[PDB]
């Protein structure tokens, strides 16, 4: 008659590591490391991301002719942008504080696009119909940005223009405009008719006087001229004033906007889907409660810490024999 004492065992092959010994077989074990994603770009909170498709941010807000099929989303948790999207500033130039603008657009709570300066009633003394270029083609024909208007002289006359908008919205208003720099002094007068011009934009906070820099630049998209792009946020109740004797690419559409800081921009070919997630990576979403992940260093949301490990298996049972 006997009574022995022992412990459990089974068919388990789960191995774990200890400080003292390596590859120890164990009866039961869990995994602390998450290495699995759904391969989709999902919603970050309750809100879906803004997918720009074939366009990037620049081409989206400026109103590139190719970015028509895209945006009137009231809000987004983050912005998706394919690595194959080249449609941005079609007219060669410099987008001032571009990266900064992207960061502030990365996530918005409300976003309505309104016509700040209606094309028909705002510019009676200038021509708002000849402002097109081969650099911005819409169906083989010469076009231009939808949210900007390229004002030129109205038959050998360019009077000092002076329009202004006052923010009656209940939120910040993103206003974009452009300054055109002709290639030759011949084009300057052919376009504005005054050889020495200036443009001034001003609000309660913004102020700057632009001077057209006339010279021959290397050809980009058939253009030896350049067109710089500027933007500013107009506080509620504040007003922004435009004044120019030429070279001003005026705003046609603006954006009433309420931004909620703390988001980013994903560049990925990964499909967008109608799914919920608390953590998003360029390769796909992560639905896990585990403390660590080795899927991707770049992440958006409340995510597990990125670890270089290949396996973090935590023993729960005992040795197997």
């Amino acid at each position: 008659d006997t009574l022995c004492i022992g412990y459990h065992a089974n068919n388990s092959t789960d191995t774990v590591d200890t400080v003292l010994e390596k590859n120890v077989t164990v009866t039961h074990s869990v995994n602390l490391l998450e290495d699995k994603h759904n391969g989709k770009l999902c919603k970050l909170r309750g809100v879906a991301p803004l997918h720009l498709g074939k366009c990037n941010i620049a081409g989206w807000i400026l109103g590139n002719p190719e970015c028509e099929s895209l945006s009137t989303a009231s809000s987004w948790s983050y912005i998706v942008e394919t690595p194959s999207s080249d449609n941005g500033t079609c007219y060669p130039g410099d987008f001032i504080d571009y990266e900064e603008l992207r960061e502030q657009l990365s996530s918005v709570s409300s976003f309505e696009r309104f016509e700040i300066f209606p094309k028909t009633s705002s510019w009676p003394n200038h021509d708002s119909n000849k402002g097109v270029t081969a650099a911005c083609p819409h169906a083989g024909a010469k076009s231009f940005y939808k949210n900007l208007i390229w004002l030129v002289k109205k038959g050998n006359s360019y009077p000092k223009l002076s329009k202004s908008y006052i923010n009656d919205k209940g939120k910040e208003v993103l206003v974009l405009w452009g300054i055109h720099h002709p290639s030759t002094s011949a084009d300057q007068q052919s376009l504005y008719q005054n050889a020495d011009t200036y443009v001034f934009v001003g609000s309660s906070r913004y102020s700057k006087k632009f001077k057209p820099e006339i010279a021959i630049r290397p050809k980009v998209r058939e253009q030896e001229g350049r067109m710089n792009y500027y933007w500013t946020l107009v506080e509620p109740g504040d007003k922004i004033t435009f004044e120019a004797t030429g070279n001003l690419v005026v705003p046609r559409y603006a954006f009433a906007m309420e931004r909620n800081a703390g988001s980013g921009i994903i560049i990925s070919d990964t499909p967008v889907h109608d799914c919920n997630t608390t953590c998003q990576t360029p390769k796909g979403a992560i639905n896990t409660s585990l403390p660590f992940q080795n899927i991707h260093p770049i992440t958006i949301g409340k995510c597990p810490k990125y670890v270089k490990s290949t396996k973090l298996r935590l023993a729960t049972g005992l040795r197997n024999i």
């Binding site: 008659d1 004492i5 459990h8 571009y98 703390g262 988001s263 490990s309």
Partner: protein
Amino acid sequence: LFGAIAGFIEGGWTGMVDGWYGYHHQNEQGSGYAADLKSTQNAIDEITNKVNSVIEKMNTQFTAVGKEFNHLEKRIENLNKKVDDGFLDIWTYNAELLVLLENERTLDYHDSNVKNLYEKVRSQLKNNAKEIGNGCFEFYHKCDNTCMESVKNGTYDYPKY
């Protein structure tokens, strides 16, 4: 660490599937394996709380890693890269060692539970049985099914040999 598992009790029983620790009786009424009710429950409850602690204590902030910098901001871009790589090394090392440390403790925890189970029956059958050395006890008086009960239940308190 406690000498019980992989120690004086060389192997485990594929036969016992009720719990982590148990017994294997061998009397006149037959044989069979029977896992300990109370002992296995505590282990499961405590090991579960352990896994939940390593997980639940990690609640992170809503942040968007990843920043954009132009060709004239290579420095702050490399600063940003440094802050990312820094966190990468701190977490990789801590996680790796956390698992190594806690795996050593978990195995010692099961070893302990077995040792303690062995000790609770040994200090209960001083003369009424002898130590084999294989974690098995050999009775001197005859022990039936209702007898084994008083050992498992710890109520071997009115000893009749």
